[PDB]
Design an enzyme around this catalytic site. Structure first.
Site, PDB file in Angstrom:
ATOM      1  N   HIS A   1       0.815  -1.217   0.000  1.00  0.00           N
ATOM      2  CA  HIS A   1       0.000   0.000   0.000  1.00  0.00           C
ATOM      3  C   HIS A   1       0.853   1.274   0.000  1.00  0.00           C
ATOM      4  CE1 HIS A   1      -3.098   2.919   1.020  1.00  0.00           C
ATOM      5  NE2 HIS A   1      -2.384   3.287   2.063  1.00  0.00           N
TER       6      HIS A   1
ATOM      7  N   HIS B   1       1.145   5.295  -2.134  1.00  0.00           N
ATOM      8  CA  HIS B   1       1.639   6.603  -1.690  1.00  0.00           C
ATOM      9  C   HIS B   1       2.886   7.169  -2.357  1.00  0.00           C
ATOM     10  CE1 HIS B   1      -0.998   7.858   1.539  1.00  0.00           C
ATOM     11  NE2 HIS B   1      -1.052   6.613   1.965  1.00  0.00           N
TER      12      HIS B   1
ATOM     13  N   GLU C   1      -5.862   9.765   0.023  1.00  0.00           N
ATOM     14  CA  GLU C   1      -6.257   8.353   0.021  1.00  0.00           C
ATOM     15  C   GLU C   1      -7.179   7.895  -1.108  1.00  0.00           C
ATOM     16  OE1 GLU C   1      -5.563   5.365   1.917  1.00  0.00           O
ATOM     17  OE2 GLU C   1      -3.826   6.605   2.313  1.00  0.00           O
TER      18      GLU C   1
ATOM     19  N   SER D   1      -3.799   1.313  -4.691  1.00  0.00           N
ATOM     20  CA  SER D   1      -3.342   0.052  -4.103  1.00  0.00           C
ATOM     21  C   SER D   1      -4.507  -0.931  -3.973  1.00  0.00           C
ATOM     22  CB  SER D   1      -2.685   0.289  -2.730  1.00  0.00           C
ATOM     23  OG  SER D   1      -3.624   0.678  -1.747  1.00  0.00           O
TER      24      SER D   1
HETATM   25  C1  LIG Z   1      -4.725  10.584   7.751  1.00  0.00           C
HETATM   26  C2  LIG Z   1      -5.768  10.263   8.892  1.00  0.00           C
HETATM   27  O1  LIG Z   1      -5.294  10.965  10.130  1.00  0.00           O
HETATM   28  C3  LIG Z   1      -5.945   8.653   9.120  1.00  0.00           C
HETATM   29  O2  LIG Z   1      -6.916   8.364  10.116  1.00  0.00           O
HETATM   30  C4  LIG Z   1      -4.585   7.927   9.538  1.00  0.00           C
HETATM   31  N1  LIG Z   1      -3.760   7.275   8.610  1.00  0.00           N
HETATM   32  C5  LIG Z   1      -2.468   6.568   8.995  1.00  0.00           C
HETATM   33  C6  LIG Z   1      -2.040   6.557  10.451  1.00  0.00           C
HETATM   34  N2  LIG Z   1      -0.895   5.936  10.875  1.00  0.00           N
HETATM   35  C7  LIG Z   1      -0.112   5.313   9.978  1.00  0.00           C
HETATM   36  N3  LIG Z   1       0.999   4.729  10.510  1.00  0.00           N
HETATM   37  N4  LIG Z   1      -0.354   5.225   8.633  1.00  0.00           N
HETATM   38  C8  LIG Z   1      -1.482   5.822   8.104  1.00  0.00           C
HETATM   39  O3  LIG Z   1      -1.634   5.682   6.747  1.00  0.00           O
HETATM   40  N5  LIG Z   1      -2.860   7.235  11.485  1.00  0.00           N
HETATM   41  C9  LIG Z   1      -4.164   7.942  11.059  1.00  0.00           C
HETATM   42 FE   LIG Z   2      -2.390   5.201   3.191  1.00  0.00          FE
END
Ligand SMILES: C[C@H](O)[C@H](O)C1=Nc2c(nc(N)[nH]c2=O)NC1
Ligand SMILES: [Fe+3]
Ligand SMILES: C[C@H](O)[C@H](O)C1=Nc2c(nc(N)[nH]c2=O)NC1
Ligand SMILES: [Fe+3]
Lengths: 307, 307
Positions: free
Chosen positions: B168, B173, B213, B232
């Site tokens: 992913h 990303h 996303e 993804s």
């Molecule tokens: C972006 C938004 O805050 C979403 O709930 C989150 N995505 C991610 C996250 N933490 C990680 N490690 N990776 C993510 O893609 N914490 C919160």
């Molecule tokens: Fe992501």
């Protein structure tokens, strides 16, 4: 259009382009008759010659004779800064003394000074063997890179040097490169030089002389020195703020063509309203430079964007 | 005003603030009954837990089972990019395949990917153990730092993952973070989150969801995907550009409060005019966030300037 570095690493091509016969070879040089000094200079030149962007600057163990010379220059000059040097200088000096080892009995290592400057404005040092062309020296400023000497003047005459040496670089230049506004200003000069015609490069060199080297700036209702050549010259630093020299407002159209000599005190100095104003004046002057393109530096990727 | 990092190194305080009981512990997780998988995940979590800004990301030797899972995801998805992915994605993919080892029989190492992104936009990766709060995850973007997972989904279901995993991160990303405009856009989101109230953080999280996303963008007279969740997802990537989903212009005042679920395909997607326009919209939205100050990132010193 003359070639110019597009990446900070491309500055490496500059090392193979300096005056191979330095001033230490001249008969009137303070250390001319000193073979030990001759070899010490060659030793410092080799360090710069073998340095490459990215690597840390080799540390060097200075001899007692050299530290003495440094101490003399340090002690005498420092007694003038509080009253003659601009605010930016005095604000940062205490910090340099505490984190870089700026003391009369110790010569700061360029690696520590470079790290310090990076934390302040992203400015970094690169050891330089000798005198670089104006185009190459100014080009480095575009990447906020200062080609800095590591060798020191000959001990026979601590209060005199016919060239830039470490006392000059560290006590004159470094403190100002720790200021954001000055950093941006000096960088603006470097950016204007990229791909500029030889004739305009000489014009930028002259502007640099009357600002970075021997510039004076307004500070409230007073006037203070910020030029590295003044800040590293006990005699001229006191002279520049007396009633003897002539003072005129910084005007690039006039400043850029003003003649000068490096043998005696300057009879005329240009006063900058501030580092930001000076930077804007440079930017405007840069627009007058015949270039079939526009340049910008991207600190994120350390590359010059050509439009 | 909630605390927030002022320097890129301060992001280190984030590691000691994640959900300690990851999804791999849930009974419905694809690898729940796999003790070998359990330990592998813990092994990856420890690497992130011990990582500190500045250090290189530890390289890991992936097992044949993991490379197979990667190959399956790689092979199937890649067949859709040329026609479904935005220009930015396709422009950079060939470069990732050649300099980062993006192949179906090889899982790229995060250290190589991070170096690559740095050369592109100054974006860098930091391995992350598990799910970070929205505040911490978005905060990192302000420094152009992406918290990236290093572990891979369980091999029993290569075409499915209830969480972000390396396939992913790298296929969804990374390609977009290699684009200057996207980089600045995503960073604008990170900057808006600094010291923002919890309620507005949730709003930025929602905006992030409908852009970074699952966002779609205009490309000439066509529409393409740029969201990492779409890029993804073999199924939704094809679905998002069909006549089934509803498309609406990107409008933060509306987007920021739009509800959504992560269990099925999105019934609604927001279309960005471009990454620059989206960035300007974020900036304007950021101005509406109750903050007794203004923030700016200085890439020269890698510090956040608070005014
Ligand atoms: C972006 C938004 O805050 C979403 O709930 C989150 N995505 C991610 C996250 N933490 C990680 N490690 N990776 C993510 O893609 N914490 C919160
Ligand atoms: Fe992501
Ligand atoms: C700045 C203007 O181009 C002036 O003539 C120069 N100064 C310097 C130089 N080279 C070095 N190494 N150090 C300087 O201070 N080359 C040229
Ligand atoms: Fe100088």
């Amino acid at each position: 259009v003359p070639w110019f570095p597009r990446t900070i690493q491309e500055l490496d091509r500059f090392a193979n382009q300096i005056l191979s016969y330095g001033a230490e070879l001249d008969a009137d040089h303070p250390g001319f008759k000193d073979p030990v000094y001759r070899a010490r200079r060659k030793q410092f030149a080799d360090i710069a010659y073998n340095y490459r962007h990215g690597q840390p600057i080799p540390r060097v163990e200075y001899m007692e004779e050299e530290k003495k010379t440094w101490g003399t220059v340090f002690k005498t000059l420092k007694s003038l800064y509080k009253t003659h040097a601009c605010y930016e200088y005095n604000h940062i000096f205490p910090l340099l003394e505490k984190y870089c080892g700026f003391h009369e009995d110790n010569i700061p290592q360029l690696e520590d000074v470079s790290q310090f400057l990076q934390t302040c404005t992203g400015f970094r040092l690169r050891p330089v063997a000798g005198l670089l062309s104006s185009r190459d020296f100014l080009g480095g400023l575009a990447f906020r890179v200062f080609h800095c000497t590591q060798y020191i003047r000959h001990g026979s005459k601590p209060m005199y040097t016919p060239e830039p040496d470490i006392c000059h670089e560290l006590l004159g230049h470094v403190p100002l490169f720790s200021d954001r506004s000055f950093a941006q200003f000096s960088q603006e000069i470097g950016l204007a030089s990229l791909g500029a015609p030889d004739e305009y490069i000489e014009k930028l060199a002259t502007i640099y002389w009357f600002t970075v080297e021997f510039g004076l700036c307004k500070q409230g209702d007073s006037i203070k020195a910020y030029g590295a050549g003044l800040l590293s010259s006990f005699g001229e630093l006191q002279y520049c703020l007396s009633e003897k020299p002539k003072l005129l407002p910084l005007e690039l159209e006039k400043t850029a063509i003003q003649n000068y000599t490096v043998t005696e005190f300057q009879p005329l100095y240009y006063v900058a309203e501030s580092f930001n104003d000076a930077k804007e004046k440079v930017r405007n002057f840069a627009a007058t430079i015949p270039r079939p393109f526009s340049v910008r530096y991207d600190p994120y990727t350390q590359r010059i964007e050509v439009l």
